[PDB]
Amino acid sequence: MNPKRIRALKSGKQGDGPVVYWMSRDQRAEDNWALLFSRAIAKEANVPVVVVFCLTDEFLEAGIRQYEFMLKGLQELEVSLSRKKIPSFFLRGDPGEKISRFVKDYNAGTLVTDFSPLRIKNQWIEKVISGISIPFFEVDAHNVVPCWEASQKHEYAAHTFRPKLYALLPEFLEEFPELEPNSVTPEVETLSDVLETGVKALLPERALLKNKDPLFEPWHFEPGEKAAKKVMESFIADRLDSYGALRNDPTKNMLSNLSPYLHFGQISSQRVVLEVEKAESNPGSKKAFLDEILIWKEISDNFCYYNPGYDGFESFPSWAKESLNAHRNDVRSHIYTLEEFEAGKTHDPLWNASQMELLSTGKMHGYTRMYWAKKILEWSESPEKALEIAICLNDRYELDGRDPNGYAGIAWSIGGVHDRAWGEREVTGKIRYMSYEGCKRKFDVKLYIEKYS
Template structure:
């Protein structure tokens, strides 16, 4: 059983897919079979004969083996009811402008559902069913469904069929080759894990993204790509970049330890689900992202001020 996805991973494809465009038609062909309303729950005919012991939530919380140095997040609440409220807020107030605002980190244009999806407090199927009922512009509706279904299931496909999903060996051959060819390239900046974690690089935009993740538990998706690519640029090897990015992502992101996180980092550092680009130092043919490119996309100064003040 695959309760995480709409189309079960092994039903969507029997192999590791090359990119979204190879999985997308398979997902769309399967949706009519799997994207259906949930059956009504039926009361069990036999009552439980024993008294259920009341849960001691304080003891349960103390028993958790977690890193308590991570700051507490207070901008969203956990649980099924909070997840439903977050979905309703997105559908009624944000969905119509999703296409135009989703890639701007200074706008509150995304759904903020990923933590709830990760912890199973709402299902992708329920989100998709609710969204399909809304009458909004096609670009926004299709764009969100692409992320919710195709891109999310593409990440599961990669991790399900690739045992090296979080290692250099999991990168496509062309990416391994080009990164190996540029291992000896001089790095203008090299930072330790502690410097990365504390947001102490020369790049205020990167530092702001790191601090957003540390204090908010959720970095904007567009900046997750820039963030990971700069770790590749400022560490001694692709392996070190992977280790640093995964450690920080899984420690601070509310939706960390998730296939989307591993694949997002692998896309940024190792060209997974991407193609070769113009060759350059350190990156080889891995897609490059720059500070200047971000400035052309959104108000960088506003983002930095908001997250570093």
């Protein structure tokens, strides 16, 4: 129980009632530092722990694909916590109003939440802080090393973050203690009803193809804590060996496929790292994978935490802003609208195939995501419009979207964040370029195109 994982958001007078874990980013019962710390505080206070989750008014900004994935997981999660005699309460509405009222109505003693560096979570925290008078803590349950501990500032390159993060692994990479149940069960609607009404409100915006059939295929990723663990186990046993060599080949399914579970916190990345470390396979594949789930994932939290404008042009490095500004008035070879990008109606079949994989499976292959976002920059009127188009499509259709990895990955692609300068080109400037011919030299683009008609 390392105290460096928990931060005080507001000191107050501890009440004589239950400790409330405001679950948000880490929707799992196992390997959850936020829930474990909440249980430890409740034990010291001779009081039980409860879990509250807020179903917010912003689910209508995404799709059925993300809403169902999350709620099906929460249905399984409610059963798991019940076995630990830990009740879960699901509120519908604004977390500022709903959690303030819950704290007062249930006489909460202490409030705990998990850590997310996203703007919308900071918005909720501000409203909640002004509506309560009990202590308020946040716990980094998503990163192996607490975000505010790994670095005290924005890191501009992976190679300046990698030694810092690795130097702290011996202290923060540790096993998880078992979640102890409440001593006795203590003293707002069913999840299937909230799922039905939510789906009914999202249906007019469901992504469809010409014959009114739904585009999304929900059988690619089963949601939930139990399914995440099987995905992790299959990756280590069947795919980890070839990951180093085939991670950039979109015609092979050699990625871990963990990002939807990681995004919703249905599995702990620290759990994955522990299991990968103790697995014996190709050391280069182990190094490459750990680089992605440790360095690149946690530097994305670092990017959003230390850059208030992480989703804006202003957070790009100066060399990239000056380069993109110098080519603002370059004639673009193509300009597509948001609707043409969305439907996959560009002149590029590779880009079109990547958009179709996004539309059908909700998870674009990691390599084509780089090509996909860089062409948006190339075929947009300005870098600002490219940012907004890329964020729109990513957050609307990616199961792992609305995520620090998304804004950091898009800022890498369009603005060179966590990248370096390359040869100067028109339109794109010194931003790393990815040509259609370059992709043909790295994988069989025809198979990828044919797979997503």
